[PDB]
Design a protein around this ligand. Structure first.
Ligand SMILES: *[C@@H]1O[C@H](CO)[C@@H](O)[C@H](O)[C@H]1NC(C)=O
Length: 358
């Protein structure tokens, strides 16, 4: 499109990830690998607003970015993920997230959005790009047979609508999460997905700030695979570029000339999964293509690193109350610590296996 949110802006580097990376790199004993690892702190990532507790951090990042821009003559851009739906991650094998539909979820989520808007409102010289609710709307395409998802459907739609509608009022550029090629990219899932995303876009007023969709968030697919990963058999859309090429025209027909961003943060190593749906701490993953607006496609505004690599996605301990058995599969790195905590060995392999090399 004419207006790529990233062009002309300097991406604010997460200091939280930078601190995690610095602490991680000093523990890497091989000096050559340690230096490569340290350099990861210079690669832009998205900040996940996974709870209300993260909102004060957002405020600090907006204010810091504003000052860095003035000190360097640049216009700054802060990258965030909105990730706090009630009954979050409805198809996952364990509940997570501070809000529940049964305890005033809608009002509490609205207040979470309101607090985010109240921060963003104060820093108009900083641009914000937001990924809207990973692991939400895609479940409403393929997973309505999952009772928790069926029961969450109206809340997910209302809450995502509230986020889109209110973040647009402060000029946030938004990409709704849209799963990945092995989820919504199956040819038979394209049209139901397009229908859902278009209805969501319509309900939020077709705001021009709703730029399009984010794909492969927190996943491992290739953008453009050299050859199809065996996990993809049966799906002609075996990588993200095939998925995006197939979905984009369906959105265009609705009057939404949508554009896309694609996570490649953990896509450096292909052919590492037994089944396509295996999502947790996949062993042997490497950092992938660095963020860039040189995307190879009319439809793609940026390759991005949405999920920061090194933070565990779930414990492998089957005794944890938060245990999801996906995290103990033969292709999951084990032992793995609780979700959100640093996973040092996984990070070191992400660095070692980076492609292109760090
Ligand atoms: C596994 O889970 C139980 C309870 O959640 C805990 O007591 C135990 O120490 C955990 N073991 C590891 C290695 O995390």
């Amino acid at each position: 499109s004419a207006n790529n949110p990233w062009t002309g802006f300097q991406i604010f580097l997460s200091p939280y990830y930078a601190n995690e990376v610095a602490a991680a790199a000093k523990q890497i004993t091989d000096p050559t690998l340690s230096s490569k690892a340290a350099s990861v702190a210079n690669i832009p990532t998205f900040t996940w607003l996974d709870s209300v507790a993260k909102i004060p951090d957002l405020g600090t990042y907006l204010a810091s970015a504003s000052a860095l821009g003035k000190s360097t003559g640049t216009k700054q851009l802060v990258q965030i993920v909105i990730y706090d739906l009630p009954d979050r991650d409805c198809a996952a094998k364990a509940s997570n997230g501070e809000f529940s539909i049964a305890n005033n979820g809608q009002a509490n989520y609205e207040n979470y959005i309101d607090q985010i808007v109240a921060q963003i409102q104060q820093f108009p010289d900083v641009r914000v790009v937001a990924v809207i609710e990973p692991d939400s709307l895609a479940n409403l395409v393929t997973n309505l047979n999952v009772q928790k998802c069926a029961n969450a459907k109206t809340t997910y739609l209302a809450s995502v609508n509230y986020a889109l509608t209110n973040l647009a009022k402060v000029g946030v550029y938004m990409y709704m999460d849209a799963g990945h090629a092995g989820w919504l990219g199956w040819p038979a899932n394209l049209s139901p997905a397009a229908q859902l995303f278009t209805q969501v876009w319509q309900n939020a007023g077709k705001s021009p700030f709703i730029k399009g969709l984010a794909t492969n968030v927190a996943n491992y697919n290739a953008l453009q695979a050299a050859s199809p990963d065996p996990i993809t058999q049966g799906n002609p859309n075996y990588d993200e570029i095939h998925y995006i090429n197939a979905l984009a025209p369906l959105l265009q027909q609705a009057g939404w000339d949508a554009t896309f961003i694609v996570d490649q943060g953990r896509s450096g190593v292909q052919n590492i999964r037994q089944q396509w749906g295996d999502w947790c701490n996949i062993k042997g993953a490497g950092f992938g293509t660095r963020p860039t607006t040189n995307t190879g496609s009319q439809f793609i505004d940026s390759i991005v690193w949405v999920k920061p690599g090194g933070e565990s996605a779930g414990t492998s301990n089957s005794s944890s109350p938060r245990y999801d058995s996906t995290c103990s599969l033969p292709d999951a790195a084990q032992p793995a610590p609780e979700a959100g905590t640093w996973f040092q060995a996984y990070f070191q392999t992400l660095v070692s296996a980076a492609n292109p090399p760090l």
